[PDB]
Amino acid sequence: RKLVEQLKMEANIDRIKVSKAAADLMAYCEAHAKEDPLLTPVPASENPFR
Amino acid sequence: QRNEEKAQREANKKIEKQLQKDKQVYRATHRLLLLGAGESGKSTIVKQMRILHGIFETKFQVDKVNFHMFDVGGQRDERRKWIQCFNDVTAIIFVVASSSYNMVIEDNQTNRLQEALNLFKSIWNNRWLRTISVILFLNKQDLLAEKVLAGKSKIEDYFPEFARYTTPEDATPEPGEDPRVTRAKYFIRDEFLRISTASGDGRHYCYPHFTCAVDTENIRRVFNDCRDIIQRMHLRQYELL
Amino acid sequence: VWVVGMGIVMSLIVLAIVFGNVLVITAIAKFERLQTVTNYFITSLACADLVMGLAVVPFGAAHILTKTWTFGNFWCEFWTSIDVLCVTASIETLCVIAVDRYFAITSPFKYQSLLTKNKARVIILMVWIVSGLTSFLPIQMHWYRATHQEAINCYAEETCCDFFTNQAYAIASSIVSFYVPLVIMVFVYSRVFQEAKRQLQKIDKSEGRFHEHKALKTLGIIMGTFTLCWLPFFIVNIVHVIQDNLIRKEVYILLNWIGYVNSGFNPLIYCRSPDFRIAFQEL
Amino acid sequence: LRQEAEQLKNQIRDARKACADATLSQITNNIDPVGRIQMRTRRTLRGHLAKIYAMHWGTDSRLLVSASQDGKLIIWDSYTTNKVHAIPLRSSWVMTCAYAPSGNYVACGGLDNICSIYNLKTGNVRVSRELAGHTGYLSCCRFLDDNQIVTSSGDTTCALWDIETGQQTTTFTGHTGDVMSLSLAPDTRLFVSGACDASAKLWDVREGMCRQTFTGHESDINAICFFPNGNAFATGSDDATCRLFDLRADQELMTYSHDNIICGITSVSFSKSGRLLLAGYDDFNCNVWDALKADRAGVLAGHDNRVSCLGVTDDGMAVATGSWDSFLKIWN
Ligand SMILES: Nc1nc2c(ncn2[C@@H]2O[C@H](COP(=O)(O)OP(=O)(O)OP(=O)(O)O)[C@@H](O)[C@H]2O)c(=O)[nH]1
Ligand SMILES: CN[C@@H]1CCc2c(ccc(O)c2O)[C@H]1O
């Protein structure tokens, strides 16, 4: 009753290929890797916790 | 400026001094947990202990020590994922209605006693509760005596091991109890201990009692068992025995 | 070549004491989970053993080997006071450990409130003060003199070392140092054994059907390893002062050195907790 | 009806299988590895009487709040290591905490089935409201603004509250097991929920209805978090595996698992750039993963007991981990 009606809503949705999503995630990571203090260690002269 | 940090360092001192006072109270109190199946008489027991002096909790004092007894919250029958929180309590109080062998709590489930054994087996063989002792309250003794005294609905109908069982030699009977009643009581008690003693590695033990939830001084029994639990823990830690 | 062989034997007795007590000192301070109320007494005992094994034994070994003393008439008294202080402070810690074990087992509910960090620190300071009072003050005041030509010549010479005392000081030092803690420890351990026996009997009565040498061995390792090594020295110390030349000196030194070797045994008797073993394996 | 439900379920599997062009590993095969990452403890906060089950940072990334089952709720200043507040609690069983985006309020909850809100900027900090409509314990609390809070309880339900009136604006249903975590979107319009029935959903705050369901795991779910982009999320289950899902592709992308690890997972979190996936564990330490390669790149093993919470500052400068030994630690 309730379950059969709910599954119909999620059955018909728009989907894209895995390749596009992977490319988008990789591009975002590559673009924002510069401003990551955990990845590239910050100099000791600009470390609040040091 | 530097004056801001001067006031901040003073704020810590006032706060850190209050925590020292809370060290004494927290370290000098004991916490107990009540467990059992439905309609087992848990609230009746705590009601009697209340007069002596969400979730249901009660605080009382015996001699000079502090005790803190709280219920499990009275939640529905379920998988217990909150049981991991109570991994440092002093002891676990288990209440079981032994006078409910010929009863069903769905309608096609096993008799309520077998449901109590199933719950006890799961609690005893728990990864988190590997160092917590259990105090057993074989509650509702008067009804069980009345059921056995009247001739009907024998134990052998539901538990076929009653015929092959006999009264233990080291089993002191009660003065008012008849031989037909003393045998019935000990059969249920040994049934619960068989699960406990089988998988025990010496870290935790089980303490059985025969109690009536309304007119029995249970307060001394809990206090004495708690003293033994602490004493045994120290002896094991010091390598002796 | 008695010296060449002995040198090594005394030498092992020096390295082992210093190395053995080094692990206990570092492990307790470095790890936060090992800093408990009871561990303070163990730390104090380890410090005392370290001081003794570092200062006393090497000088005695040098005196025994070189067959002469070189420092003079001041370092001799300093070394004597140091060894008396280290011996007296080592024994009295064991009595405190026995007492706090007795308090923990006999009275479980009041044990948490009875002992705290301040009380433990005060007790340790008082024990150290009592130990120091009987070592430096009586020697420096020169209250342990002797009345015969040999002692007078010994104190006149600047190259000879020997221990001469009168009856009163020896008796007082022995009573203060060894005899008083022994009776307390014996009574405490007897009471603890009685409590353990009662608890085991209760356990057996509760669930005997479906289901004490451990206590015997645990108490024996603690008691015998101390008594059988330290009683002979004190009995001969009391005997030889009240009697005239009933025993040779070599026996006196030999019975004295057993007390020094006891410091090696102590960290094996204690510090057997699984946490200690894990820390030692890691480090 | 039963036959119709089974037929509809096959459509979802058929459509998902058609869109699987290639795995994520082959696409990022040529990416140079990050290498070995090592961190050193910078601070250690003490003053908690018992185990710690909650933690949350602030927007300024300087002050944080921690909750313990001793009946206390302490606010720290990690720069100088000085306690600022200590709020006593009516109930000693606390399983969650939160910190308002504006910094004026702090939330709490636990086995008492009641959420509580305290007013920091009054001293005499006291309870402001008590949102008491639930059955079963609470698992997580999050703040949308100064007047909206989302809570997930243990009765397979989630609700959106209203602090001013203390009433439920809307409720979400559909789970068959206890809900254990949630995480708001960066724009605070969508959120997820990891239940104990080995599934996750994607609710809508305005509509109050589910949109998608992911069932890639095989046991209970204990943690969840979003990718900084907002189009992906990672899950940490009772088994040793962590999985990364994608909303647009509606499929599981990549799994992080090791043969040696056989314990559970209690918390997960990402990095500032969404490149590292730090996950806690039950074997007394924490691990650092790689989002695009599933290669371990360091172990944080300075804890003497299991790790129960984990968080990363908004500016991505430090990682704070709590445990059951009542000690917090700041890594950099
Ligand atoms: N005859 C008799 N009945 C008892 C006794 N103790 C408890 N009961 C029964 O217990 C009932 C009271 O219910 P509670 O004790 O509150 O049961 P409960 O606390 O809800 O236990 P849970 O359902 O597990 O939460 C009474 O109606 C009694 O019939 C007893 O000693 N003698
Ligand atoms: C140099 N050897 C001394 C001599 C006597 C003596 C010692 C230790 C404790 C005492 O109470 C003593 O009386 C020994 O360490």
PDB file of N, CA and C in Angstrom, chain B residues 95-166:
ATOM      1  N   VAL B  95      15.314  -9.186  37.557  1.00  0.00           N
ATOM      2  CA  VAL B  95      14.057  -9.559  38.193  1.00  0.00           C
ATOM      3  C   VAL B  95      13.293 -10.457  37.232  1.00  0.00           C
ATOM      4  N   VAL B  96      12.917 -11.643  37.703  1.00  0.00           N
ATOM      5  CA  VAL B  96      12.201 -12.623  36.901  1.00  0.00           C
ATOM      6  C   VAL B  96      11.021 -13.151  37.704  1.00  0.00           C
ATOM      7  N   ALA B  97       9.882 -13.313  37.036  1.00  0.00           N
ATOM      8  CA  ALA B  97       8.671 -13.833  37.666  1.00  0.00           C
ATOM      9  C   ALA B  97       8.650 -15.343  37.477  1.00  0.00           C
ATOM     10  N   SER B  98       9.026 -16.076  38.523  1.00  0.00           N
ATOM     11  CA  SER B  98       9.105 -17.529  38.444  1.00  0.00           C
ATOM     12  C   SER B  98       7.745 -18.209  38.502  1.00  0.00           C
ATOM     13  N   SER B  99       6.697 -17.502  38.924  1.00  0.00           N
ATOM     14  CA  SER B  99       5.365 -18.079  39.038  1.00  0.00           C
ATOM     15  C   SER B  99       4.552 -17.936  37.759  1.00  0.00           C
ATOM     16  N   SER B 100       5.211 -17.810  36.612  1.00  0.00           N
ATOM     17  CA  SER B 100       4.548 -17.599  35.330  1.00  0.00           C
ATOM     18  C   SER B 100       5.054 -18.597  34.298  1.00  0.00           C
ATOM     19  N   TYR B 101       5.125 -19.873  34.685  1.00  0.00           N
ATOM     20  CA  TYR B 101       5.552 -20.893  33.734  1.00  0.00           C
ATOM     21  C   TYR B 101       4.440 -21.255  32.754  1.00  0.00           C
ATOM     22  N   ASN B 102       3.196 -21.309  33.216  1.00  0.00           N
ATOM     23  CA  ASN B 102       2.068 -21.654  32.348  1.00  0.00           C
ATOM     24  C   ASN B 102       1.371 -20.396  31.833  1.00  0.00           C
ATOM     25  N   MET B 103       2.148 -19.541  31.171  1.00  0.00           N
ATOM     26  CA  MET B 103       1.620 -18.295  30.634  1.00  0.00           C
ATOM     27  C   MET B 103       2.354 -17.956  29.346  1.00  0.00           C
ATOM     28  N   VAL B 104       1.673 -17.218  28.471  1.00  0.00           N
ATOM     29  CA  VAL B 104       2.232 -16.777  27.199  1.00  0.00           C
ATOM     30  C   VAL B 104       2.086 -15.265  27.103  1.00  0.00           C
ATOM     31  N   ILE B 105       3.171 -14.593  26.731  1.00  0.00           N
ATOM     32  CA  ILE B 105       3.160 -13.143  26.592  1.00  0.00           C
ATOM     33  C   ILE B 105       3.147 -12.756  25.119  1.00  0.00           C
ATOM     34  N   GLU B 106       3.697 -12.251  20.965  1.00  0.00           N
ATOM     35  CA  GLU B 106       2.567 -12.898  20.310  1.00  0.00           C
ATOM     36  C   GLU B 106       1.981 -13.989  21.198  1.00  0.00           C
ATOM     37  N   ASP B 107       0.794 -14.472  20.831  1.00  0.00           N
ATOM     38  CA  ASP B 107       0.145 -15.534  21.588  1.00  0.00           C
ATOM     39  C   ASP B 107       0.769 -16.900  21.341  1.00  0.00           C
ATOM     40  N   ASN B 108       1.579 -17.048  20.296  1.00  0.00           N
ATOM     41  CA  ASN B 108       2.230 -18.313  19.982  1.00  0.00           C
ATOM     42  C   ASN B 108       3.673 -18.371  20.462  1.00  0.00           C
ATOM     43  N   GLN B 109       4.121 -17.380  21.228  1.00  0.00           N
ATOM     44  CA  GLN B 109       5.478 -17.403  21.755  1.00  0.00           C
ATOM     45  C   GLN B 109       5.617 -18.489  22.813  1.00  0.00           C
ATOM     46  N   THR B 110       6.863 -18.828  23.132  1.00  0.00           N
ATOM     47  CA  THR B 110       7.121 -19.777  24.199  1.00  0.00           C
ATOM     48  C   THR B 110       6.665 -19.197  25.536  1.00  0.00           C
ATOM     49  N   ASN B 111       6.577 -20.067  26.540  1.00  0.00           N
ATOM     50  CA  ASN B 111       6.148 -19.631  27.860  1.00  0.00           C
ATOM     51  C   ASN B 111       7.092 -18.566  28.409  1.00  0.00           C
ATOM     52  N   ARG B 112       6.540 -17.673  29.237  1.00  0.00           N
ATOM     53  CA  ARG B 112       7.265 -16.464  29.620  1.00  0.00           C
ATOM     54  C   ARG B 112       8.591 -16.787  30.296  1.00  0.00           C
ATOM     55  N   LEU B 113       8.674 -17.924  30.982  1.00  0.00           N
ATOM     56  CA  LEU B 113       9.930 -18.315  31.606  1.00  0.00           C
ATOM     57  C   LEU B 113      11.010 -18.498  30.546  1.00  0.00           C
ATOM     58  N   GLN B 114      10.699 -19.233  29.475  1.00  0.00           N
ATOM     59  CA  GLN B 114      11.670 -19.432  28.405  1.00  0.00           C
ATOM     60  C   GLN B 114      12.048 -18.126  27.720  1.00  0.00           C
ATOM     61  N   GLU B 115      11.150 -17.142  27.704  1.00  0.00           N
ATOM     62  CA  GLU B 115      11.520 -15.820  27.214  1.00  0.00           C
ATOM     63  C   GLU B 115      12.490 -15.133  28.169  1.00  0.00           C
ATOM     64  N   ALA B 116      12.324 -15.354  29.476  1.00  0.00           N
ATOM     65  CA  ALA B 116      13.246 -14.779  30.448  1.00  0.00           C
ATOM     66  C   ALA B 116      14.622 -15.427  30.357  1.00  0.00           C
ATOM     67  N   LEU B 117      14.670 -16.750  30.179  1.00  0.00           N
ATOM     68  CA  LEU B 117      15.952 -17.423  29.991  1.00  0.00           C
ATOM     69  C   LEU B 117      16.649 -16.943  28.726  1.00  0.00           C
ATOM     70  N   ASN B 118      15.890 -16.753  27.645  1.00  0.00           N
ATOM     71  CA  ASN B 118      16.487 -16.294  26.396  1.00  0.00           C
ATOM     72  C   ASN B 118      17.098 -14.908  26.552  1.00  0.00           C
ATOM     73  N   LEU B 119      16.417 -14.017  27.274  1.00  0.00           N
ATOM     74  CA  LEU B 119      16.959 -12.681  27.495  1.00  0.00           C
ATOM     75  C   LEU B 119      18.181 -12.729  28.404  1.00  0.00           C
ATOM     76  N   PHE B 120      18.148 -13.581  29.431  1.00  0.00           N
ATOM     77  CA  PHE B 120      19.285 -13.695  30.339  1.00  0.00           C
ATOM     78  C   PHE B 120      20.514 -14.235  29.619  1.00  0.00           C
ATOM     79  N   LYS B 121      20.317 -15.203  28.720  1.00  0.00           N
ATOM     80  CA  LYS B 121      21.439 -15.767  27.977  1.00  0.00           C
ATOM     81  C   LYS B 121      22.107 -14.715  27.101  1.00  0.00           C
ATOM     82  N   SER B 122      21.311 -13.867  26.448  1.00  0.00           N
ATOM     83  CA  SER B 122      21.877 -12.824  25.598  1.00  0.00           C
ATOM     84  C   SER B 122      22.636 -11.787  26.416  1.00  0.00           C
ATOM     85  N   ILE B 123      22.089 -11.393  27.569  1.00  0.00           N
ATOM     86  CA  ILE B 123      22.753 -10.398  28.406  1.00  0.00           C
ATOM     87  C   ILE B 123      24.057 -10.951  28.965  1.00  0.00           C
ATOM     88  N   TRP B 124      24.040 -12.202  29.430  1.00  0.00           N
ATOM     89  CA  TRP B 124      25.231 -12.790  30.034  1.00  0.00           C
ATOM     90  C   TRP B 124      26.369 -12.909  29.027  1.00  0.00           C
ATOM     91  N   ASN B 125      26.065 -13.353  27.810  1.00  0.00           N
ATOM     92  CA  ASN B 125      27.080 -13.519  26.770  1.00  0.00           C
ATOM     93  C   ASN B 125      27.146 -12.274  25.882  1.00  0.00           C
ATOM     94  N   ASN B 126      27.456 -11.149  26.516  1.00  0.00           N
ATOM     95  CA  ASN B 126      27.569  -9.866  25.839  1.00  0.00           C
ATOM     96  C   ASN B 126      29.020  -9.412  25.838  1.00  0.00           C
ATOM     97  N   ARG B 127      29.451  -8.835  24.714  1.00  0.00           N
ATOM     98  CA  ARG B 127      30.835  -8.391  24.591  1.00  0.00           C
ATOM     99  C   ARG B 127      31.147  -7.263  25.566  1.00  0.00           C
ATOM    100  N   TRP B 128      30.232  -6.302  25.707  1.00  0.00           N
ATOM    101  CA  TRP B 128      30.490  -5.164  26.585  1.00  0.00           C
ATOM    102  C   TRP B 128      30.377  -5.551  28.054  1.00  0.00           C
ATOM    103  N   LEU B 129      29.429  -6.424  28.389  1.00  0.00           N
ATOM    104  CA  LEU B 129      29.197  -6.819  29.779  1.00  0.00           C
ATOM    105  C   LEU B 129      29.986  -8.085  30.118  1.00  0.00           C
ATOM    106  N   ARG B 130      31.303  -7.990  29.952  1.00  0.00           N
ATOM    107  CA  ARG B 130      32.204  -9.100  30.231  1.00  0.00           C
ATOM    108  C   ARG B 130      32.814  -9.041  31.625  1.00  0.00           C
ATOM    109  N   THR B 131      32.526  -7.990  32.404  1.00  0.00           N
ATOM    110  CA  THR B 131      33.078  -7.870  33.750  1.00  0.00           C
ATOM    111  C   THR B 131      32.052  -7.375  34.764  1.00  0.00           C
ATOM    112  N   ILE B 132      30.759  -7.549  34.503  1.00  0.00           N
ATOM    113  CA  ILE B 132      29.701  -7.057  35.379  1.00  0.00           C
ATOM    114  C   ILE B 132      28.934  -8.248  35.936  1.00  0.00           C
ATOM    115  N   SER B 133      28.816  -8.304  37.260  1.00  0.00           N
ATOM    116  CA  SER B 133      28.085  -9.369  37.925  1.00  0.00           C
ATOM    117  C   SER B 133      26.581  -9.138  37.814  1.00  0.00           C
ATOM    118  N   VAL B 134      25.817 -10.189  38.101  1.00  0.00           N
ATOM    119  CA  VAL B 134      24.363 -10.162  38.000  1.00  0.00           C
ATOM    120  C   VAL B 134      23.775 -10.618  39.328  1.00  0.00           C
ATOM    121  N   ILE B 135      22.794  -9.873  39.829  1.00  0.00           N
ATOM    122  CA  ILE B 135      22.024 -10.256  41.007  1.00  0.00           C
ATOM    123  C   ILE B 135      20.645 -10.684  40.527  1.00  0.00           C
ATOM    124  N   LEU B 136      20.242 -11.897  40.889  1.00  0.00           N
ATOM    125  CA  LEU B 136      19.015 -12.503  40.389  1.00  0.00           C
ATOM    126  C   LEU B 136      17.944 -12.470  41.469  1.00  0.00           C
ATOM    127  N   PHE B 137      16.747 -12.027  41.096  1.00  0.00           N
ATOM    128  CA  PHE B 137      15.601 -11.954  42.000  1.00  0.00           C
ATOM    129  C   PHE B 137      14.502 -12.854  41.448  1.00  0.00           C
ATOM    130  N   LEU B 138      14.413 -14.080  41.963  1.00  0.00           N
ATOM    131  CA  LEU B 138      13.356 -15.009  41.563  1.00  0.00           C
ATOM    132  C   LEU B 138      12.069 -14.574  42.256  1.00  0.00           C
ATOM    133  N   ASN B 139      11.398 -13.608  41.635  1.00  0.00           N
ATOM    134  CA  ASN B 139      10.300 -12.890  42.262  1.00  0.00           C
ATOM    135  C   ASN B 139       9.025 -13.734  42.287  1.00  0.00           C
ATOM    136  N   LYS B 140       8.022 -13.210  42.996  1.00  0.00           N
ATOM    137  CA  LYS B 140       6.677 -13.787  43.057  1.00  0.00           C
ATOM    138  C   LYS B 140       6.713 -15.246  43.515  1.00  0.00           C
ATOM    139  N   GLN B 141       7.222 -15.445  44.730  1.00  0.00           N
ATOM    140  CA  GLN B 141       7.334 -16.795  45.271  1.00  0.00           C
ATOM    141  C   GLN B 141       5.992 -17.328  45.760  1.00  0.00           C
ATOM    142  N   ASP B 142       5.142 -16.456  46.310  1.00  0.00           N
ATOM    143  CA  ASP B 142       3.891 -16.917  46.905  1.00  0.00           C
ATOM    144  C   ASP B 142       2.959 -17.523  45.861  1.00  0.00           C
ATOM    145  N   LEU B 143       2.868 -16.903  44.682  1.00  0.00           N
ATOM    146  CA  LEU B 143       2.010 -17.440  43.630  1.00  0.00           C
ATOM    147  C   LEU B 143       2.488 -18.811  43.173  1.00  0.00           C
ATOM    148  N   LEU B 144       3.805 -18.986  43.043  1.00  0.00           N
ATOM    149  CA  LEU B 144       4.342 -20.277  42.624  1.00  0.00           C
ATOM    150  C   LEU B 144       4.022 -21.361  43.644  1.00  0.00           C
ATOM    151  N   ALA B 145       4.121 -21.037  44.935  1.00  0.00           N
ATOM    152  CA  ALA B 145       3.767 -22.004  45.968  1.00  0.00           C
ATOM    153  C   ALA B 145       2.292 -22.373  45.896  1.00  0.00           C
ATOM    154  N   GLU B 146       1.426 -21.388  45.649  1.00  0.00           N
ATOM    155  CA  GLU B 146      -0.001 -21.668  45.524  1.00  0.00           C
ATOM    156  C   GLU B 146      -0.288 -22.544  44.310  1.00  0.00           C
ATOM    157  N   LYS B 147       0.386 -22.279  43.190  1.00  0.00           N
ATOM    158  CA  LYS B 147       0.164 -23.066  41.980  1.00  0.00           C
ATOM    159  C   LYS B 147       0.547 -24.525  42.196  1.00  0.00           C
ATOM    160  N   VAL B 148       1.688 -24.763  42.845  1.00  0.00           N
ATOM    161  CA  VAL B 148       2.150 -26.130  43.064  1.00  0.00           C
ATOM    162  C   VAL B 148       1.270 -26.839  44.087  1.00  0.00           C
ATOM    163  N   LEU B 149       0.843 -26.122  45.130  1.00  0.00           N
ATOM    164  CA  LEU B 149       0.048 -26.745  46.188  1.00  0.00           C
ATOM    165  C   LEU B 149      -1.261 -27.302  45.642  1.00  0.00           C
ATOM    166  N   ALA B 150      -1.975 -26.508  44.848  1.00  0.00           N
ATOM    167  CA  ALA B 150      -3.166 -27.007  44.179  1.00  0.00           C
ATOM    168  C   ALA B 150      -2.769 -27.965  43.064  1.00  0.00           C
ATOM    169  N   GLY B 151      -3.514 -29.059  42.934  1.00  0.00           N
ATOM    170  CA  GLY B 151      -3.153 -30.056  41.946  1.00  0.00           C
ATOM    171  C   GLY B 151      -3.750 -29.794  40.581  1.00  0.00           C
ATOM    172  N   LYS B 152      -2.977 -29.122  39.727  1.00  0.00           N
ATOM    173  CA  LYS B 152      -3.337 -28.859  38.338  1.00  0.00           C
ATOM    174  C   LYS B 152      -2.178 -28.157  37.641  1.00  0.00           C
ATOM    175  N   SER B 153      -2.071 -28.323  36.324  1.00  0.00           N
ATOM    176  CA  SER B 153      -1.062 -27.642  35.514  1.00  0.00           C
ATOM    177  C   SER B 153       0.345 -27.895  36.056  1.00  0.00           C
ATOM    178  N   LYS B 154       0.745 -29.163  36.028  1.00  0.00           N
ATOM    179  CA  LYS B 154       2.043 -29.553  36.556  1.00  0.00           C
ATOM    180  C   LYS B 154       3.169 -28.995  35.688  1.00  0.00           C
ATOM    181  N   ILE B 155       4.356 -28.892  36.293  1.00  0.00           N
ATOM    182  CA  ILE B 155       5.517 -28.353  35.589  1.00  0.00           C
ATOM    183  C   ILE B 155       5.906 -29.255  34.426  1.00  0.00           C
ATOM    184  N   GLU B 156       5.732 -30.570  34.591  1.00  0.00           N
ATOM    185  CA  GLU B 156       6.150 -31.521  33.566  1.00  0.00           C
ATOM    186  C   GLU B 156       5.438 -31.303  32.237  1.00  0.00           C
ATOM    187  N   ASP B 157       4.265 -30.666  32.246  1.00  0.00           N
ATOM    188  CA  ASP B 157       3.558 -30.399  30.998  1.00  0.00           C
ATOM    189  C   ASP B 157       4.357 -29.466  30.096  1.00  0.00           C
ATOM    190  N   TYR B 158       4.975 -28.438  30.673  1.00  0.00           N
ATOM    191  CA  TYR B 158       5.720 -27.443  29.911  1.00  0.00           C
ATOM    192  C   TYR B 158       7.223 -27.686  29.924  1.00  0.00           C
ATOM    193  N   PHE B 159       7.770 -28.154  31.041  1.00  0.00           N
ATOM    194  CA  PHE B 159       9.184 -28.516  31.139  1.00  0.00           C
ATOM    195  C   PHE B 159       9.286 -30.005  31.434  1.00  0.00           C
ATOM    196  N   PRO B 160       9.636 -30.837  30.451  1.00  0.00           N
ATOM    197  CA  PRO B 160       9.641 -32.289  30.665  1.00  0.00           C
ATOM    198  C   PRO B 160      10.808 -32.804  31.494  1.00  0.00           C
ATOM    199  N   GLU B 161      11.682 -31.933  31.989  1.00  0.00           N
ATOM    200  CA  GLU B 161      12.810 -32.353  32.811  1.00  0.00           C
ATOM    201  C   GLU B 161      12.485 -32.369  34.298  1.00  0.00           C
ATOM    202  N   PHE B 162      11.244 -32.064  34.678  1.00  0.00           N
ATOM    203  CA  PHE B 162      10.876 -32.075  36.089  1.00  0.00           C
ATOM    204  C   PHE B 162      10.854 -33.494  36.648  1.00  0.00           C
ATOM    205  N   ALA B 163      10.450 -34.469  35.830  1.00  0.00           N
ATOM    206  CA  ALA B 163      10.368 -35.850  36.299  1.00  0.00           C
ATOM    207  C   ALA B 163      11.745 -36.406  36.645  1.00  0.00           C
ATOM    208  N   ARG B 164      12.764 -36.057  35.862  1.00  0.00           N
ATOM    209  CA  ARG B 164      14.112 -36.567  36.074  1.00  0.00           C
ATOM    210  C   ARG B 164      14.904 -35.760  37.096  1.00  0.00           C
ATOM    211  N   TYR B 165      14.310 -34.733  37.692  1.00  0.00           N
ATOM    212  CA  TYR B 165      14.992 -33.877  38.651  1.00  0.00           C
ATOM    213  C   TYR B 165      14.657 -34.297  40.077  1.00  0.00           C
ATOM    214  N   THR B 166      15.620 -34.102  40.975  1.00  0.00           N
ATOM    215  CA  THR B 166      15.456 -34.426  42.385  1.00  0.00           C
ATOM    216  C   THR B 166      16.034 -33.297  43.227  1.00  0.00           C
TER     217      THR B 166
END
